């Protein structure tokens, strides 16, 4: 259902508010109609993706802006500088959000977005697909819902029933796919085929795409909140940021691609490990050294890598390398610093700020 999608050009015939289309789809689904429900569900999914991409494009345009040079006197007053810069950012974001068409319709409520993030409409979509003789699409929808939620019961029985049906053994595809996971799968397949250059090219293409996606998912995570108490300035904003920080730290593991039903651990570490092994197999140390440095940064304990790092160090210039080849890549530094700082901030916050007035129910 993602075939006829284009962020640059979106047909105006299907620009309705998200809740209206979703409610119409459910009302038709309860009314035993199938084709109309299928079309409306596809419309709703497309609209949600367009809204997400519009938010991403809006938040990439504003933050990545040059900092204006202020007057000499204003540099002596820190708080005014900081909040003036933040105010300029907010004004630019508000001005640029009156743009893209998807932001000129009704704003969905929090619960609709919450359930859409939970990928629940795919269940109704798969039932509708079954009721309209589109078996590969139904299989794909069932697998797509199963990937996010692997502990359910009825979906397992449905998937077993579909697998029992003949022919349905190759259309198992993830509808909500991303670029970097496909690139990673292709790179791993090439690596196991003892092919090196293709692995390097595809993996290097994969790296910055994942970094960009992760930064976007961090940026768009600063959602709203429901007001439930009145406090002073500092406390009543610190609580908001504590909640946002929780939802932020719950972001790295979500983006992790899964294969064989077991999500991989230390994804960037695996990336750099494969890159280093390929570069070593190509005997180009000039690129090999930074990968080893970065992975050893990400994991402080590994005998194998300490050994070959020492062996690398034993040949100071035998391969012809300089001191500019024993420091980590900038991107890995950025990622590691962001992750560590978020972890430390949450750890510090969950000792003093939030009130301890709720306990386990006995």
């Amino acid at each position: 259902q993602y075939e006829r999608y284009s962020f640059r050009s979106f047909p105006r015939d299907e620009l309705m508010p998200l809740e209206s289309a979703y409610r119409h789809a459910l009302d038709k689904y309860s009314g035993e109609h199938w084709a109309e429900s299928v079309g409306y569900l596809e419309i709703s999914l497309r609209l949600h993706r367009l809204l997400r991409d519009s938010e991403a494009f809006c938040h990439r345009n504003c933050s990545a802006a040059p900092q204006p040079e202020p007057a000499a006197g204003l540099a002596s007053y820190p708080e005014l500088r900081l909040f003036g810069g933040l105010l300029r950012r907010a004004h630019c974001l508000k001005r640029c959000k009156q743009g893209l068409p998807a932001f000129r319709q009704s704003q969905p409520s929090r619960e609709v977005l919450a359930d859409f993030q939970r990928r629940e409409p795919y269940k109704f979509l798969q039932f509708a697909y079954f009721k309209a003789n589109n078996l590969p699409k139904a299989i794909a929808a069932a697998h797509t819902f199963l990937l996010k939620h692997p502990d359910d019961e009825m979906m397992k029985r449905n998937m077993a029933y579909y697998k029992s049906l003949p022919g349905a053994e190759d259309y198992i595809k993830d509808l909500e796919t991303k670029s970097y996971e496909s690139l990673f799968i292709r790179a791993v397949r090439a690596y196991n085929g003892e092919n090196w250059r293709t692995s390097i090219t595809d993996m290097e293409l994969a790296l910055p795409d994942f970094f960009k996606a992760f930064y976007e998912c961090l940026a768009a995570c600063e959602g709203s909140r429901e007001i439930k108490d009145f406090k002073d300035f500092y406390l009543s904003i610190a609580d908001h940021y504590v909640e946002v920080l929780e939802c932020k730290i719950q972001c790295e593991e979500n983006l992790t691609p899964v294969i064989g039903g077991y999500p991989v651990e230390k994804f960037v570490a695996t990336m750099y490990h494969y890159l280093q092994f390929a570069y070593y197999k190509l005997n180009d140390l000039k690129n090999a050294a930074p990968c080893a440095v970065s992975y050893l940064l990400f994991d402080q304990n590994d005998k194998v890598m300490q050994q070959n790092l020492v062996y690398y160090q034993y040949h100071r210039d035998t391969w012809g390398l300089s001191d500019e080849h024993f420091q980590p890549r900038p991107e890995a530094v950025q990622f590691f610093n962001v992750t560590t700082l978020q972890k430390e901030l949450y750890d510090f916050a969950k000792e003093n700020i939030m009130d301890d007035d709720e306990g386990e129910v006995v």
């Binding site: 508010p17 909040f83 009145f230 406090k231 002073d232 904003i237 610190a238 900038p330 991107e331």
Partner: protein
Amino acid sequence: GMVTPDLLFAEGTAAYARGDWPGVVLSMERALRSRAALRALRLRCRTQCAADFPWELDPDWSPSPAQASGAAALRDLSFFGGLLRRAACLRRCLGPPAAHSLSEEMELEFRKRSPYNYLQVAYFKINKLEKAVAAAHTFFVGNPEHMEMQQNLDYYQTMSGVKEADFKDLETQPHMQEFRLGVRLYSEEQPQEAVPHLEAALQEYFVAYEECRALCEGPYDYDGYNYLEYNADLFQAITDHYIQVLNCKQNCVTELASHPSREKPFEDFLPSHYNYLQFAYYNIGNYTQAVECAKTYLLFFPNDEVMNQNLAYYAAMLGEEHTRSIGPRESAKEYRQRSLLEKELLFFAYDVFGIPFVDPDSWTPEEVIPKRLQEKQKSERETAVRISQEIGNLMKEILDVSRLTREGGPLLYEGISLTMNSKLLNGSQRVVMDGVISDHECQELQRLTNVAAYGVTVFKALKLGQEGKVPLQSAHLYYNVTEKVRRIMESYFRLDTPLYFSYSHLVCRTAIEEVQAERKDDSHPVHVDNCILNAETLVCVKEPPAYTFRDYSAILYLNGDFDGGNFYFTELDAKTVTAEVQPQCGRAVGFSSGTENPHGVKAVTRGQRCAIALWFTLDPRHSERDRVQADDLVKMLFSPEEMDLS
């Protein structure tokens, strides 16, 4: 023991109702000391925490491209880490936050110092004349509109043990008293004792100012029930909260110079201080201090002629090298720099977000204001001077002056006929005009209110129209008609100051014929929108639980077929009827919301009656926070833009 003050106030009031004077004096003194201790503790903690962890700033960076998002993430994380550390220390210092939340009513009764009246009564009951006269004097100074307590301290002065020097205030701040004493005692042309007091009156001011700046970080001020549908992002919450905090900070320089004896705040406080100081210094003969004071005044208004002459005369009399030697006072320079930067930020916020602000100082240079605000101010001054010239010419052409000058307008829109003027309607500031809109518009408004419904604001109607429940043209017509009625009603009354909204909602009344049995009581008692009328007392009160900023009021009807539910104007006694207006289609009634115009509505009979009510204020501080949102929404929906996605 740091107990909540309103509980002690209630206990003391109950004891006074019983009449136990020792109880009431104990309770009132405990409550006052509790408030003082609470304020001191909050100030000390909030001013120590922000000084223990200074605000950091390390902006030295130049990002290589495509290495851009990471820098933003790092900067944001560092800033919020600093904020979190500050908040942690502040929370660990302050303590239990329940006691600090008190409603308004005790705030107003604290402002009026009624507990001091209770103390004076109690102290007289127990023969404590010194404290009794102290309380009487401080209540008189706080509110000098009670002749009875004037007789009270006169009778207190009749019996012995009372001295003139015993009249000591207990509530007014030190700097204001010192400044007033200095000015008064310099008025006798005695220059010596003038210099020290004013100098003291200088220093305290700055210190006092600091404390106000540390008592402005308070809870957000939601517009009543608007927190149920609040949907602001984090970076919107920061901006809104900080803008409100900055506004409340900058509002302090118009409060530190407002004494309750005077009806209006003093003007140009610090420059007046410096002017009096320089005059006294010259009279005493401290010449260098005099040239210093003149120079530091000249830093505020750089274009004053008399003081230019004074400085020139001092510089000609004195050696020029000494005139060059001394510059302006450093503290005034620092204060000016801080205030100017704050004003620049606030004016940018006013330009962009449409959050109103009014300058409290008269010395700002005109380079800190954006262009659009300058153009709007020029237009406002132009229309004000035009109205002044028109009214002057009209007076030259001449209750009659009020009846012929304050109303009678152009009626700029066509099709409007003055039906009932002030002279016919038996009173002042009443207008009844017909044909504001045609029947079609009334029909669409009735359809809008019938489709969905007592609380449909223009913003809510536009939002529902955007959603799709109600047709959009009806909402657009509603917005246009409310703007039209604002314009015409404002222009009819010859108002120089621009007019602003305060509330505007549509309503419908549905007669319930099954509950009309023995319903002889009026639908709504006669009252006034500005104040609260206490019926038989025949006296109003500008009491904050009743809105005191609404100035003009207007109502327009839509339907033309029912019975009952008329509209009438009633005198202050709440008995006699002065005039009545028969409802019809397109009828508009407008009046000033002052105490001179009490309005009344009769009960309704069979049918439905729907109409729109509107209230306008003249103070730009009190404008809706949803009108700008509605304007932005209409600009969204009916003024589309385009930007290249490729």
